[PDB]
Design a protein around this ligand. Sequence first.
Ligand SMILES: O=P(O)(O)O[C@H]1[C@@H](OP(=O)(O)O)[C@H](OP(=O)(O)O)[C@@H](OP(=O)(O)OP(=O)(O)O)[C@H](OP(=O)(O)O)[C@H]1OP(=O)(O)O
Length: 168
Amino acid sequence: RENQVYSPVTGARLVAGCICLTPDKKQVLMITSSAHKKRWIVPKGGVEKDEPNYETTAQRETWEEAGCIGKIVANLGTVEDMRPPKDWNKDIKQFENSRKDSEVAKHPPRTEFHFYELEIENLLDKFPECHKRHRKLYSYTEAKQNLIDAKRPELLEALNRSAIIKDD
Ligand SMILES: O=P(O)(O)O[C@H]1[C@@H](OP(=O)(O)O)[C@H](OP(=O)(O)O)[C@@H](OP(=O)(O)OP(=O)(O)O)[C@H](OP(=O)(O)O)[C@H]1OP(=O)(O)O
């Protein structure tokens, strides 16, 4: 429903999420997509009109989607979902070409993500989406490949800004 908040500039939907790390920072918590049962992503969801800050949305979504509780130790800033609209590929105009580079035709972002780094304090076996998704820890290398397989580079960018140990 329209409790959703949008960028007043780009009309992008405003989303907050967490990069949930283990205390040793060797692993990150991932959840399976609802629409696509095999795509592994990280907890995130739409900011609602009542919510006073992005941290609120991020910790609410981390609980609802991944039954995870922890403390926010870092602001990982913003990343954007620059996937083109559903209109794309049945359009006449598709790409915009430079002399030494190629780009997708200029379009507004779908989503603006505000990500936080969380240190996991507890994982509970029961949470609101406990039967709708799976949830598992992955090393950096495993995590990175999951996000490419999920076709979500903006989520990998968020992961890369975290303190996750990448030497594994
Ligand atoms: O609201 P959210 O943040 O929880 O995200 C929902 C959904 O939002 P909605 O509330 O408007 O339905 C997204 O729709 P858009 O905002 O992109 O239009 C959808 O992205 P999509 O276009 O299908 O793209 P992909 O599935 O190919 O990535 C996303 O798929 P995932 O991120 O892969 O899981 C879903 O995640 P969730 O259901 O939690 O697993």
